[PDB]
């Protein structure tokens, strides 16, 4: 398993945690020196567990699908909570054995979580304090605030593992929460498209078959057309397969 403790945390310990999470995910090699995730996996081996503890030391354990870095659900005390989607129902057959299972009233999809939370990612502050609050919400399972808590946790763990830029954004917000940058949102939105295009580029002299539009540090549209881009060389850390 991997773990992150907010108590005693620093930029250094957070980066160690994100690095450990990246290292915990199996590969079928690399493409342009970027880890390629597995296309398929079986049973319990399809998951890695991530223990998260708040400032007060209260802990939850989150299950991640290694094929796509999607969060499946989590365990607190003797109760597990899984997203309402087939891949998470599958996960419930293999992890947190012996727990009492609760099916959440939403899938782990951003659109569904945002509808459930009554607010879009763009307006939800992120940072170490936001992570603390999110863990607390899930620890007590406040059903009215859980969707928002998942939105914070997903971005602070999975999205951060996928993009060095997002890891940096969380680090900027260690002391004071802030809503995600437009760049953060675009990278999250385009992860699967970037993953696809980078793999196609291998046999196309490094050129994407279809451009991918990201946003920069000022929200300006930037069209990514080849593997020379900084998004490919010094940002993306995991490719969907
Ligand atoms: C009752 C239950 O928890 N299982 C549901 C399953 O019925 C549904 O088909 C799927 C969405 O496709 O999501 C699962 O969580
Ligand atoms: C969802 C749930 O049952 N969470 C409970 C929490 O509310 C309670 O404060 C604690 C007591 O130690 O046990 C937790 O994990």
Residue numbers in the entry: 1 to 241
Q: What did the paper state?
A:
Here, we report the high resolution (1.4 Å) crystal structure of luffaculin 1 and the protein sequence derived from this crystal structure. The crystals of luffaculin 1 belong to space group P1 and diffract to 1.4 Å resolution with synchrotron X-ray radiation. The crystals of luffaculin 1 contain two enzyme molecules (A and B) in the asymmetric unit. A comparison of molecules A and B shows that the overall structures of these two molecules are almost identical with rmsd of 0.181 Å for 221 Cα atoms. The structure of luffaculin 1 contains two domains: a large N-terminal domain composed of eight α-helices and eight β-strands, and a smaller C-terminal domain consisting of two α-helices (α9 and α10) and two β-strands (β9 and β10). The electron density of luffaculin 1 clearly indicated the existence of two well-defined N-acetylglucosamines (NAGs), each covalently linked to an Asn residue at positions 77 and 84, respectively. Although the sequence of luffaculin 1 is not yet known, the high resolution of electron density, combined with the known sequence of homolog luffin a, has allowed us to undertake an 'X-ray sequencing' method with a high degree of confidence.
Luffaculin 1 is a new type 1 ribosome-inactivating protein (RIP) isolated from the seeds of Luffa acutangula. Luffaculin 1 not only possesses rRNA N-glycosidase activity as expected, but also inhibits proliferation of tumor cells, induces apoptosis and differentiation on tumor cells.
